Design an enzyme around this catalytic site. Structure first.
Site, short mmCIF file in Angstrom:
data_model
loop_
_atom_site.label_atom_id
_atom_site.label_comp_id
_atom_site.label_asym_id
_atom_site.label_seq_id
_atom_site.Cartn_x
_atom_site.Cartn_y
_atom_site.Cartn_z
N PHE B 118 -2.61 25.00 92.05
CA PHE B 118 -1.69 26.01 91.56
C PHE B 118 -0.88 25.41 90.41
CE2 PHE B 118 2.43 28.25 91.54
CZ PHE B 118 1.98 29.55 91.31
N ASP B 203 0.72 17.62 87.25
CA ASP B 203 1.62 18.70 87.63
C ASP B 203 2.42 18.25 88.86
OD1 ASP B 203 2.91 20.93 88.72
OD2 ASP B 203 1.28 22.32 88.21
N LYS B 232 11.32 23.14 89.86
CA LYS B 232 11.72 23.36 91.25
C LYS B 232 12.92 22.50 91.61
CE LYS B 232 7.97 25.84 93.37
NZ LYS B 232 6.56 25.77 92.97
#
Ligand code: NA
Ligand code: NA
Lengths: 383, 379
Positions: B118, B203, B232
């Protein structure tokens, strides 16, 4: 090419339409961080909203909703054509969502071959691979490998060109009602009405990018209200958050069903955006925007009477463009930097156009002072 | 979700009815320092009184400070700030493509990524993402993206050539069942990138910013990427992101040490960084993981529900036995009913991503509630 501030111009403090740098130099802000700070810097209502929500709850995942998001969704739904609202962090993300939705709606409601997106030369929709490919400056989409295909560009305000490339394989027309980056060029009512009718005829979705011209900028809450042309999808950001990163994608139930009437939304972002909305969406502010525009335009005409630099003053509300005469083609960056040195922050809209996007509540005294500083900057450039 | 959170403090959350929950989900590994941390509230309030916003034409003191902190603590020499992990990923992928274009060849465009990855929901990032279902149906995807199985180095070797511009990988696949990269795999990717002159892109939006017990996962592995993304936890709940790289790579862009960055966001992220990047917090993470895992083992000893416990630091995956395959949502909903917020990682895996400073008392209470929820589903 790009406008970068030098090392001796770092903003440290803002209040209303005034900005101070590291050396304590004061500037009048007619730029708004590129039409973002629509209520000026550290507005008391927005600071209060940030502080109270900041004590309570900042974050929820896309799995949950929250009270600030629901309140903001309700306000947007009540104030516009929208029946459904999806919240993100930026106009780029909102545009991603809008373009993806238009594509997906066509795929599932009509045909998987209905993929063509029509956009316009000089358009700006963001810097993600997809949005920059829908954007109409090849310079910014070249050099990143294979672009998402089936995007066609024609000139802004050219209805004949749109008719020529539009068919039943078209899923969307994407347009800024006013092209802010592209010389502050407004759509003609004929053009925009024609886009609506062509989209109806071909069962394509009309997507309005109002990230720059929306949220009171024109003197109406959204530019579509000025034109009386209702889009299928609308995107909003920048001013929506007054400086806090937040964005919204507005559409109908019918369209949104392709994916409580609200999705996503940062609690903190939506609290601030709610306070911003409550102030902007009032007769007082919206009607005051027309008065303020007239005040700016008067000064621009007075400067032009003294120095003879402009060939056109245009835009809507407090999005103002001033096109430079041919003898000053390509000098917009120079006027901008001279402005800065004189203590006034302005914008360009390409190398031939000056742009202004001050606070929607900018005080008259700031309009006067900033424009006197801009007049002084103009003198240094031309005389 | 059938409840609406209205208030949070540390690892506890209240809904509209005033029901109190233990938060082991962290808004999907975002609230790394819990809800309304006083140092983060103070930073928000202080910068909120000073300056919120600058356009990308300018820098600002919080952006510069946060840049310096990330530069000093990592391989990075340059930092680009955005609002979200999706945006940072867009920037990283575009930069990898553009670097290859102007430094090597315009035909050097292949991006290698992994199944179950993702990377975001923008068209480009979801196309690099390894879940075809989520990239289908949006018209022509950007081309020259190849997916192979996560941890399959042979497969990477097979598709990688001199036309490859990037390998994009999550050091731990959060969404993809909480699967950690093997050291051999990650070192293999580094060597292959060096060999074919491709950029290694990490990532670390989910596994970064202290999540694993090191500041970033690459530090655990000792494998240095060319580009890294972070979001995040970076802002502890405030939307902010960073793309980290070297001057040599960053120079492919058409500006000092940092680019962009919302002053308010960067002030909050700076306070978050200052707290997370400490021996106290980082070392505390291992102790807290052990406590969580012991609770999970106790639950398994009683109920026989799990086949595997994995992840790193305070990103925890608990894989369900075949008897309970596809029923992760059921345990999730039961958890909520029992007053504990947890996550899934596919329908076969339970995921936990609590505050990095989660109190032991909350660990025990929340896990006891989860035990009650497990007990309910079993009975
Ligand atoms: Na409505
Ligand atoms: Na460094």
């Amino acid at each position: 090419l790009p406008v970068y501030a030098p090392a001796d111009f770092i903003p440290v403090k803002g209040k209303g339409s005034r900005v101070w740098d590291q050396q304590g130099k004061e500037y009048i802000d007619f730029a708004g961080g590129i039409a973002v700070t629509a209520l000026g810097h550290c507005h008391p209502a927005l600071v209060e909203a940030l502080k109270s929500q900041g004590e309570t709850l900042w974050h929820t995942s896309r799995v949950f909703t929250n009270e600030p998001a629901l309140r903001l969704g309700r306000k947007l739904i009540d104030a516009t054509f929208a029946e459904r609202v999806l919240f993100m962090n930026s106009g780029t993300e909102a545009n991603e969502t809008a373009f993806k939705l238009a594509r997906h709606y066509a795929c599932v409601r009509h045909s998987p071959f209905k993929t063509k997106i029509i956009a316009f030369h000089n358009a700006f929709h963001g810097r993600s691979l997809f949005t920059v490919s829908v954007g109409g400056q090849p310079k910014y989409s070249d050099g990143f490998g294979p672009k998402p295909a089936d995007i066609i560009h024609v000139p802004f305000n050219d209805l004949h060109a749109v008719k020529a490339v539009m068919d039943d394989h078209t899923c969307a027309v994407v347009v800024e009602p006013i092209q802010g980056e592209g010389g502050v060029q407004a759509a003609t009512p004929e053009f925009l009405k024609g886009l609506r009718d062509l989209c109806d005829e071909h069962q394509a979705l009309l997507v309005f990018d109002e990230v720059q011209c929306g949220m009171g900028r024109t003197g109406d809450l959204f530019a579509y209200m000025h034109y009386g042309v209702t889009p299928d999808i609308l995107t909003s950001a920048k001013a929506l958050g007054g400086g806090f990163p937040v964005s919204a994608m507005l559409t109908t139930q019918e369209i949104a069903s392709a994916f409580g009437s609200t999705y996503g939304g940062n609690p903190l972002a939506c609290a601030v955006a709610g306070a911003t909305f409550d102030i902007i969406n009032t007769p007082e502010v919206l009607q005051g925007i027309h008065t303020k525009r007239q005040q700016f335009v008067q000064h621009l005409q007075a400067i032009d009477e003294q120095f003879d630099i402009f060939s056109d003053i245009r835009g809507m509300g407090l999005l103002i463009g001033a096109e430079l005469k041919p003898k000053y083609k390509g000098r917009a960056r120079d006027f901008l930097y001279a402005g800065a040195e004189a203590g006034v922050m302005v914008l360009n809209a390409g190398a031939d156009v000056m742009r202004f996007a001050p606070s929607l509540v900018v005080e008259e005294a700031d309009i006067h002072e900033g424009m006197q500083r801009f007049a002084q900057a103009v003198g240094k450039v031309v005389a």
